[PDB]
Ligand binder design. Sequence first.
Ligand SMILES: O[C@H]1[C@@H]2CNC[C@H]1OC2
Ligand SMILES: O[C@H]1[C@@H]2CNC[C@H]1OC2
Ligand SMILES: [Cl-]
Ligand SMILES: [Cl-]
Ligand code: NA
Ligand code: NA
Ligand code: NA
Ligand code: NA
Lengths: 659, 659
Amino acid sequence: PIVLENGKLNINIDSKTGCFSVTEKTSGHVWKSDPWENAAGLLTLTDSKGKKQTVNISKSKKIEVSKTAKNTVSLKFIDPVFEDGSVAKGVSIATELRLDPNNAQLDVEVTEHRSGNFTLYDLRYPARAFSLKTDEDKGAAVIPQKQGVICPSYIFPMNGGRFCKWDDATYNNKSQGSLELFNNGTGLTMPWWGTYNEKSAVMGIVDVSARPHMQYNINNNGQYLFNAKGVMSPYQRIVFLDPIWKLDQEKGKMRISYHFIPGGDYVDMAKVYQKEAKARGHFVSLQEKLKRNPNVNKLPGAIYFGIYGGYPHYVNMPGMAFTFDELKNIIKTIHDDLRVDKAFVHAWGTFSNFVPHNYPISEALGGPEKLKAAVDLAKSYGYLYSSYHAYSPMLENDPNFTTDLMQRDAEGKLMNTGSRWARVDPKFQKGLAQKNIEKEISYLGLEADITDITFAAYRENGKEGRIELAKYIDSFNLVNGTEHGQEQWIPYFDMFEGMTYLEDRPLSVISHPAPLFNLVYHEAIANFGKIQDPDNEVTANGDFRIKALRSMLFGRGTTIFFAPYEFEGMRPMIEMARDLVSPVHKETFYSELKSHEYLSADYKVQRSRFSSGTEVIANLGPVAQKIEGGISIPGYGYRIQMKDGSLKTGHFQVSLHMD
Amino acid sequence: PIVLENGKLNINIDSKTGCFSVTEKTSGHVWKSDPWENAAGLLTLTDSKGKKQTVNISKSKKIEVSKTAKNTVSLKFIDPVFEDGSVAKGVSIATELRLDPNNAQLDVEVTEHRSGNFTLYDLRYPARAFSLKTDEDKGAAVIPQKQGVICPSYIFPMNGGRFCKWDDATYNNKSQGSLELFNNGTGLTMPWWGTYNEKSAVMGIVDVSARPHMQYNINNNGQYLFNAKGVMSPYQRIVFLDPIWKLDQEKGKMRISYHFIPGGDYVDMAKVYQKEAKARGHFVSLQEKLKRNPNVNKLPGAIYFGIYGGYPHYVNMPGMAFTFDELKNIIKTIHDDLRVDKAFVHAWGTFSNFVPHNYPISEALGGPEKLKAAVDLAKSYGYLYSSYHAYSPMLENDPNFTTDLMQRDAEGKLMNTGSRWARVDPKFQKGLAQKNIEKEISYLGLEADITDITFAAYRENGKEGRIELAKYIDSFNLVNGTEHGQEQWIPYFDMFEGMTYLEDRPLSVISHPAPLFNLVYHEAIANFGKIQDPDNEVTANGDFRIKALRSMLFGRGTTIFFAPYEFEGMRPMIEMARDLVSPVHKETFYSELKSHEYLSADYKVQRSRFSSGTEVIANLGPVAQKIEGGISIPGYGYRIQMKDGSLKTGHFQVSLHMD
Ligand SMILES: O[C@H]1[C@@H]2CNC[C@H]1OC2
Ligand SMILES: O[C@H]1[C@@H]2CNC[C@H]1OC2
Ligand SMILES: [Cl-]
Ligand SMILES: [Cl-]
Ligand code: NA
Ligand code: NA
Ligand code: NA
Ligand code: NA
């Protein structure tokens, strides 16, 4: 065996297979190679008859493993072998393992691939590495899926219904699959993932130039590999996360940097990526943003209100659209009746054309002067205000619809025919914003802006146009926000609407929400609930009780998103948000989320600590549970230590009034 | 154009295409043929090169339409033409349209298909028929997806977040697809579906011998047909539901009977099917079941308690398993402290072997005598009791695991390797129940039984074994329930645990729950909430507020499903169910659900009328809303007229307790 070693790690590379193990020398923990098939990597390629096949590259005809430098091992897998015994003659995969001379860091890189007469698709490399043994390791996979989740590597007590779904999912296809980087759907918002047990943690950070997918396997024994054969899997239940290098598409550097943390968990992983986040330029603190714009301080303790008038989906829809007089009266009631001290008022439906033509201010809704009166009222309260804006849609029901503003692919076919909200080519969108945004800022005297859709993902295609638009909006120095966000956009915005959780999502029945994104970026970007899943709606992600408590634990602001006719039904939740969440949001707004912990066996009792000196303990389940010292946290209850040392305790109650 | 006609319907058939329209003469509404491509049918078949393709059979080389009897039109489609212009020589499809002499019923049947050298797969016939024009017809598709849903054919006011998800789904792939009949997953529980507008309704009943799939299209303009071509759809947004005849599989009669109802909606459709359900033998009323077994009357007003001890998933799991003394104390507390007058206690975890070996009563949990003390206490209260039973699983973690009792297919491959709870061939399952169920009945003096899994679906494979097991269980004459159920199993059981809603399901963001199954079968089978989505858990289907109100509107009983450690947190929901749901469930239990109505434009206020003289009005949304007479229904509120003349009014309230 070839050995790479420094003061902290020993890398044992098998010269016959290319598989490697990593010994973390201070804990003695040994991270293993693929426990199922001893595969260094899993390559998907076409065979001589053209059918896609997936092969173990450790079964290649020739495997070369040599130490080409002091801390570098080069590997070459030559002529993989198909299941029928034929050979992909002329296919080769070259990789490298590079141990940092000093730190507990191992770089793994696919350096070259040769495809011969075959076509190469996916490469899982390293394959099924750094795994946890289910119900032996007591730890978790760590996945920054949107705000982030952990997946425990063992079965634990929980509500009986949740338990049945959890355990069942670890045995069927719900616990295996892949996710992508930097989308607003089911995918990841940070280019890292990892695993930990009680002894140590490992995480891999993907090179800034690459876009692998992430394969997950959450306590599954690989039965999915044998269902088509109709045999029972002979493998052990394990947790693993693998990079999927898309050899057919990838033109970046196929490198992942593994960091090994003794005694670490998801918090320590986030802090390690935080250092890389700063080096990549994503991290621009809220304090720097506040120095540039003092109106940023209208955000701490503010409730985000979206008054949804059926727009952009429809123009002046009956029964949903608000007039500007009705808009003004809602703002007045929020301030005078509901005593909301700080607010971001977001009015969806102020223009008489469909987006992307965000103008003129609608005469049918009352006209420019009536909208200005509503905005002037909000500004007299110290509220932030923005209308709904979007420069990316191209809607079938718009009379101005045209494919001329749409993008076409290499075949000349229209792109995003099935995604109406992102049909305009980003290279056109600054020009669209330029048509009226400066007129609206000037006329209404705007201090804030929120822009929809365009910055919800970070894809390569069109990024230059999106950066152009981001720079244009940011040049106005308004307190600005955007839908969902991604880390690459943090320098340009003050708040993200979203960066929480999809309602329907892979892993939902076998994961726990964890504030991975905010553990990295809470100092640099404020987030609020997503408008489709706001704190006033009851969804897979909870009711107001659960969402308010998770808000304080994770460091996000309250979102109240409603059609005008619902307003009277919103008052009780606006009041509870004002009383409970807003003061904590205010105190913690600029701080670092230093730590998050799970404090109960069922993961429902959690504790967050912010660098403001604020501590939030909350219990997101129905039954009172005790923590260290025998302190009891009531069901749907909280125990909050404020910066001045005062202690807030309480709980939500659902009751039935009968006349 | 060939015409079939009686006093109630005019059927207009086009001689060139085979498309037909139906004029419903009482209202004058005309059901048009395929508004998109003038396709009588859509046939999926392989071409001369073996590529699957889908063709418009109205483009066939020869189409023959002849009136072959007084009320029969025969159609033949000969030699379909592919996209390239090649002919499928030797392929033909023969159909018939048969108008009933007196009634507004039209039978449509695929009588014959010939493949030649090609292979035929799916036939949509009739294609895109009985459609609604989006935002023109105000009405809905009607789909018995589990308990049932309707899908409005027009946009309407609703919560802003819901509105965005709803409308977006009508423009992407969430609003098109297919469902299957008689599964416990995403599919249909009754073999019919329909569409209605403000003038007229049509519904189709699938022949008892057939198993088509159901294609749905909910306000989609067919963009999914064009995304791969990268062009915009030229078609209108419409709602349709189509049969998908599986020509490669179907051995039954490929017939669907359409019934036409002037002024009808989903209630009328359900009552039409209720007649057919009695003809099919499914309908055995709860009153006859009570005549056979007086203890059935322990069910009305009973809360279904599932005490989930981590079993069947694990044997004596630490932190989840209950002892029999602990079980007895939970029962005592439910009765003496929580004052629950009627209950079905279901104890998950009483045996020391894994299912399918439901024995012996566990010594580790306390032994048979202590279990008997728990059951005797429950019986002294008048409660029903059952242990958890299952005869279908074969679990990887069972020391007794063997493939001996699993089914194999013609190639010798194990079946259900991907579905651990349903692996024992049903032909063995009665034998497995015979091992101990009679010993448990006589030792514990059981009055009740619940059996898991085996009756959650109705597939052809193994149904004879399942009937054998159901007949055996029914021969004991216990008050008996089963998981989920299907209409074919109603004769053998008193209650179904489930028959409500999956949490994540196709159409969830573009449909409203409707009590379609209970509109048919409430007099014949009692149902309770599903254990994975019980009334004490907050999910996509609501919190306790929403679920308790829906329970009374739909006519189902409360389900409280909890791990033992959660019990103290269940107290407030048990009390609220006891005071609000239980008296209404008790009164309406044996009755017909005569009618259901949506009374608000957002469909959140609803009214159900039961033949016991009970009227339930409830508001499943947060804001108070007015109905006829200016009566106001509070948010999460109810107005219930009882048989004894009392009017129950009230509402749920969430309150924040800050100490
Ligand atoms: O997990 C599921 C499975 C089937 N029925 C409900 C639960 O129990 C076994
Ligand atoms: O429906 C969605 C779409 C994108 N942003 C949120 C909502 O508004 C437009
Ligand atoms: Cl959150
Ligand atoms: Cl229900
Ligand atoms: Na999957
Ligand atoms: Na800004
Ligand atoms: Na779909
Ligand atoms: Na019975």
